[PDB]
Ligand binder design. Structure first.
Ligand SMILES: [Ca+2]
Lengths: 87, 81
């Protein structure tokens, strides 16, 4: 399974993708280094989550991504169209 | 915002989409009639609730039961805007 954030930017740049991860990491009080298996695919950012001191799960962080979508958008200029978990 | 489940079905039948919701409702302990704004579009089921995060998390928790009971594969579960 992987977490994902779909944007309105196709192709999404890898640098922009990891800016989203930085903002998300700040919000959930995790190091952004705990986002692993990262790739951008089309308009989407995909990732997994490493064992972390917060015991944050993939489900936790993607839910939070949806919750703080406005902040992600405000700081990057992207629109966040979908957040979720895939296989 | 809306919830969605992307399946491997091309396209997903309305009957199968609602069967997913029926099973999901039982797991979250609400009436399936509380799922509203329902549509199937391509391989995806979309819906709202009369939280979305709660139900999509639940859909991950019981993904194997959803797949086994409906005969399809769940490729993505999430919330859209
Ligand atoms: Ca902190």
């Amino acid at each position: 399974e992987y977490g994902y954030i779909v944007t309105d930017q196709k192709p999404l740049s890898l640098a922009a993708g990891v800016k989203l991860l930085e903002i998300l990491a700040e919000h959930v009080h995790m190091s952004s280094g705990s986002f692993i298996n990262i790739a951008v695919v089309g308009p989407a950012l995909t990732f997994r989550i490493r064992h972390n001191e917060q015991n944050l799960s993939l489900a936790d962080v993607t839910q939070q991504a949806g919750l703080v979508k406005s902040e992600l958008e405000a700081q990057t200029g992207l629109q966040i169209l979908q957040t979720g978990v895939g296989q």
